[PDB]
């Protein structure tokens, strides 16, 4: 489910945040994504 | 078997800095 404030637990990385579609360019060996200051940015869906 | 290679290096803990391209690849690297 997307576009709502949902408690999320992707691959053991737990937290709270709204989720939606993204136009990232993930490489095949890539799972997570961070930014310049080391916080989880985008997660590839393991089942999607 | 048959009827100019073997380049072997040894790594050590060294700080590196890698230039990540906008797509997510790496384009340049410098050794510290």
């Amino acid at each position: 489910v997307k576009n709502k404030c949902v408690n999320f637990n992707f691959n053991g990385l737990t937290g709270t945040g709204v989720l939606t579609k993204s136009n990232k360019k993930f490489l095949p060996f890539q799972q997570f994504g961070r930014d310049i200051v080391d916080t989880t940015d985008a997660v590839r869906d393991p089942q999607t | 078997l048959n009827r100019a290679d073997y380049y072997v290096g040894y790594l050590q803990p060294r700080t590196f800095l890698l230039k990540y391209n906008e797509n997510g690849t790496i384009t340049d690297a410098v050794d510290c």
């Binding site: 490489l27 890539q30 997570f32 994504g33 | 990540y20 797509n23």
Partner: peptide, 24 residues
């Protein structure tokens, strides 16, 4: 057989330490 000539690696031999997307 083989030789033991020594050359320089130049800028070479870099892999991704992790699997985390980054840009700019």
């Amino acid at each position: 057989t083989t030789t033991q000539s020594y050359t320089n690696s130049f800028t070479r031999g870099v892999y991704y330490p992790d699997k985390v997307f980054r840009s700019s």
